[PDB]
Amino acid sequence: MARVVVDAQAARAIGKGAMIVFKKGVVRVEGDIKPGDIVEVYTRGGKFLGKGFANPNSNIMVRIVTKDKDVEINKDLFKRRIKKANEYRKKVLKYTNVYRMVYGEADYLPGLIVDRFNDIASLQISSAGMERFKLDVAEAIMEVEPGIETVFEKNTGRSRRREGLPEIERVLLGKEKYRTIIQEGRAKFIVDMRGQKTGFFLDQRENRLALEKWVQPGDRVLDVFTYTGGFAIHAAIAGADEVIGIDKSPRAIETAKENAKLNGVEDRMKFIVGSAFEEMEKLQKKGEKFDIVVLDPPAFVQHEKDLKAGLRAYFNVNFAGLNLVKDGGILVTCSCSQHVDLQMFKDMIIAAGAKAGKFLKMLEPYRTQAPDHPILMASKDTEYLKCLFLYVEDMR
Amino acid sequence: MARVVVDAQAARAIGKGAMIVFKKGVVRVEGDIKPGDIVEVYTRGGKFLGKGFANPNSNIMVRIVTKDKDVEINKDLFKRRIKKANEYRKKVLKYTNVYRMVYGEADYLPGLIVDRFNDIASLQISSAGMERFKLDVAEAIMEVEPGIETVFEKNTGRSRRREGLPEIERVLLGKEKYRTIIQEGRAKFIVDMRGQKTGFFLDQRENRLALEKWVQPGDRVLDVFTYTGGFAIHAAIAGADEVIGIDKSPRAIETAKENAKLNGVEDRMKFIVGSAFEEMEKLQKKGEKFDIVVLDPPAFVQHEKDLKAGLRAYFNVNFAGLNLVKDGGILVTCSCSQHVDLQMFKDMIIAAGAKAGKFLKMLEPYRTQAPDHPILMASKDTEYLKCLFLYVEDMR
């Protein structure tokens, strides 16, 4: 088995809880290595640090799986960890039927993400090493969670492509089922595995539920990047009198309309297919003002190098959103860009508020991704979502 | 009326929403100024910027009350703002009988804090300027909120001795009443305006309520700085089998015992009068472990320059607290030091976890002070409480 020797900085980080070896921390490699191989990690002094998945072609050269030299990496190890991950959601978080079951490193299963939608589980692998155990993982999921009757492989996305793995979408194990109706609070949503723009993201669960208490009868609500209707639907079932949802994807809007029908709130909802900026300007010129405006744009920052331009994009979206909020109204604004930290997001909102001449007060704490997407204090990369609920008032 | 001339930077800030003038930003003062005097603020060019309370003995020279030269600062202006502040809690936050009614600058009433405990309003003034309108504010409170039948003046403590104001404690207006029983969720608490160890702080409301969901029947809980029993009581009624509450004040513990009796949980609790560190060391020695450990220490940091020593103290308290949490347990830790921002607090927690060899996952969003203590985005000074709920796992 190949040995990856790392430098002092790399070893120090692992000693503090890090479970990855960056290419920049590799001093040398003893033995041949191909993407996906299991290798051992050592300090220059020959001290064993751990064993894990290697990828010589990645910034993340090694994802440590175990710090115990005698522990074998196989289906049994992953099954025990998947069971632990599942129990965490059901017994600690008290989630039922619908939740993210496995969130990579946070659950000690680097490169693996598993979402449970009732009796269907979606699997996504972004580590060449973990890919070798794909089928074993699929079997383990159904063995520890009998509620799952289908494992659907959704191996697509930036992470998948970054690792150089082929994109694959198909029923991997179990019954050939790909659509289900999930319940989130009092709301229902259509979840379909096949295709895109017809999904539902679980990371915003707590924030969507948190919105309900702020909706008041007679309320007029605007969801700028509605997608399949997550926040919009929750606002409507909460009693909003009128809700307008905007999204660039025609497919996403078609599903949103279906969700509205499923929840019996089609009468109070209007979905528009189009660009956020153009649609907001039309509303602005009309002198339109909303009681609540929700901004949940796509990650504008994919690389740390794109921060400046990305933050400018957020500034422009938030400025436009703020101008559509009535005096004494509410602005809900989020960012899913991992590279944009809370402080940066906050400074950007303060700047937008200043320009729009509005005082902003916090109504909720600094919100994040749902706890089934655990934020590990020792691994900054696990955290990516920021959400703020703000009371908007004209500075006069 | 005396005039304070400011530089381009200070004026620029005010234009962005700032409501203060730092003594360092004053280019010159025209006319004699006494603490509490109302003065006008102008740019070097002669443009009016605002009017407010002056304090020639502080890093903050002026607390801006109004930016309109025509608006007179008197009881009528404050009555208007106290009413707006009160409606914010009742209509937006949906609080009913117990809440902080006014939180100084956040409600455009610098130097004034008013807490409502059912029919008793507790008033605290921290500036000489506001002190001149003390009776007018008391009358205004009862005028806009008929629910208040007594206005109690609690003008004692460091916050009061800070600006050299006289210490005073008495019923200022209304019925001679000092005690009331408040309801917070399913818990009841005795509040007595007299003294300092028979009180209850409203800023932790949402965090105390948030603890409920994490308590499992049979749980053993440790409340290290329990004061009058806030968190401890909520944990006991939520189903904890044993709750140990520690506090240095014998009087605070006497109140905690009365609160336990009021909630019918006296048999589930154990109170200890002593030092936090000494008492935790005793538990550590016996190898005691808890399902939940709550750390709510005093503000260790009081000055930017005192971050090193203050943060070291937080580290020590959190390290000691972490070693008392069982594997799979929960640590609730917070800081009320204004000078310690969220990132500094996070880094300190991360350091403590690394030293104790524990992985820490967040269970709740980044929690803060209750919304009736509004955090103004344009005024960092309004935010002071940070609170984290963490799931603790042994690294080894």
What are the structural domains of chain A? 2-71 (2.30.130.10), 72-178 (3.30.750.80), 179-396 (3.40.50.150)
DSSP-based three-state secondary structure for B262: helix
Longest dimension (CA), chain A: 70
Amino acid identity of residue B229, one-letter, is G
Q: Is B336 one of the annotated active-site residues of the chain?
A: yes
Q: State the pairing for strand pair A48-54/A3-6.
A: unpaired
Q: DSSP letter at A376? A: B
Q: Which of A393, A8, A385 is nearest to A207 (CA)?
A: A385
- Select the residue of B361, B371, B374 nearest A376 (Cβ to Cβ): B361
CB A296 within 8 A of CB A334: yes
Cβ atoms within 10 Å, residue B266: 14
Can you tell me the distance from the alpha carbon of B165 to that of B131, in angstroms, rounded to the nearest whole number? 9
Smallest CA–CA distance, residue B350 to chain A, in Å, is: 6
CA pair distance A198, A211, nearest whole angstrom: 22
Q: The tokens of B16 are what? A: 């962005």
- Determination method here? X-ray
Length of chain A (residues): 396
User: Which is nearest to B325 in space by CA: B351, B347, B357, B350?
Assistant: B357
Cβ pair A82, A140 in contact under 8 A? yes
What is d(CA A283, CA A290) in angstroms, rounded to the nearest whole number?
10
A359 CA to chain B: closest CA distance, Å? Answer: 7
The CA distance from A111 to A123, in Å, is 11
Residue A171 and residue A178 in contact, taking contact as beta carbons nearer than 8 Å: yes
Q: With left for phi above 0 and alpha for psi between -120 and 50, is residue B334 left, alpha or beta?
A: beta
Neighbours of B217 (CB within 10 A): 8
- Cβ atoms of residues B42 and B29 within 8 Å: no
Order of all β-strands in the sheet with B26-30: B20-22, B60-66, B48-54, B38-43, B3-6, B26-30
Beta-bridge partners for A152: A122, A171
Cα–chain-centroid distance for residue B392?
A: 27
What is the nearest CA distance from B136 to chain A, expressed in angstroms?
Answer: 26
Q: Distance between CA atoms of A19 and A105, rounded to whole angstroms? A: 8
Q: Do A17 and B353 touch (CB under 8 A)?
A: yes
- Burial class of residue B102 (count of CB atoms within 10 Å of its CB; 0-12, 13-18, 19+): buried
Q: What residues of A act catalytically? A: 336
Run of H or E residues at A82: helix A75-87
Three-state SS string across A138-170, please?
HHHHHHHCCCCCEEEEEECCHHHHHCCCCCEEE
The residues on A that touch B, with CB distances below 8 Å, are 16-17, 88, 92-94, 106, 206, 213, 328, 342-343, 346, 349-350, 353-354, 359-368, 371, 374-378, 387, 390-391, 395
Q: Give the burial class of B24: count Cβ atoms within 10 A of its Cβ; 0-12 exposed, 13-18 middle, 19 or more buried.
A: exposed
- For chain B, the maximum distance between any two Cα atoms, rounded to a whole number of angstroms, is 70
Q: Do A378 and B353 touch (CB under 8 A)?
A: yes
Instruction: Centre a 10 Å sphere on the Cβ of residue B137 and count the other Cβ atoms it contains.
Output: 25
- How far apart are alpha carbons B356 and B318 in whole angstroms? 10
Question: Of B52, B50, B67, whose CA–CA distance to B129 is shortest?
Answer: B52
DSSP E strand stretches across chain A: 3-6, 20-22, 26-30, 38-43, 48-54, 60-66, 98-103, 112-117, 120-125, 150-155, 168-174, 179-184, 187-192, 220-223, 242-247, 269-273, 290-295, 325-335, 358-362, 386-394
Cβ atoms within 10 Å of B309's Cβ, excluding its own: 10
| DSSP conformation class of A276 | H
| Active-site position among B61, B336, B356, B392 | B336
**How many Å apart are CA B223 and CA B324, to the nearest integer?**
11
The angle formed by the CA atoms of residues A386, A185 and A369, to the nearest 5 degrees, is: 15
